[PDB]
């Protein structure tokens, strides 16, 4: 037989399954991130051999 | 003029090489901020779930 | 009810300053953003003017 | 022909330039993310602040 204690035990298992939530939703965000962290370091070596190319691309070529 | 071909493969080569390293690091951020969107409303859904219990039970 | 009050109180703060670090969030991710998109068009802007570099004085 | 020697100058200068600011602009990126990454960290600690409060209220009192 259904009562008001049956609905209370409904509204704090939403309470806590939208906390569970929200620590995925903040694990998901850092994963990101880190996968950008990556990329940009990615970019910062890939930058600097770029670098080094166009240097010795000029001081080999003066009509460059 | 033989180095300079060689070397100017190369130098193209890696130019793509950050271009495609440019495009996923946009898209890993664009990610992170479809994420906060839906962490802004999961907030929002939890303080307003609180405040219902608080006016019903208190 | 006292003990209820205290705790309500601080709870709700709690939750207003969770709301303001996801906006500052927000805000700090499109500060990397814009970053990342001024570096895709300086980049651009670099391969472009090595391109006509090598389109004038070069075969 | 010394016109030929300046235009070669000024764009030599223009690449290598340019080089650097997309150095600088790594940097600073890196810097921006790193920003963001301490501020989901931040969050994740808070919401678990938060969590404990909300068990802590839970638990203390039945009605709610």
Same mark, same amino acid.
Do not use: F, G, I, P
């Given at each position: ?6 609905? +209370? ?20 965000? *850092?994963?990101? +991130? *880190? ?11 890939? *930058? ?13 070529? *003066?009509? +460059?």
């Amino acid at each position: 037989s259904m009562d008001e204690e049956c609905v +209370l035990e409904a509204e704090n298992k939403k309470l806590v399954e939208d906390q569970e939530k929200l620590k995925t939703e903040l694990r998901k965000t *850092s994963d990101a +991130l *880190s996968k950008a962290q990556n990329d940009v370091m990615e970019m910062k070596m890939q *930058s600097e051999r770029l670098s080094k190319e166009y240097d010795q691309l000029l001081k080999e070529h *003066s009509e +460059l």
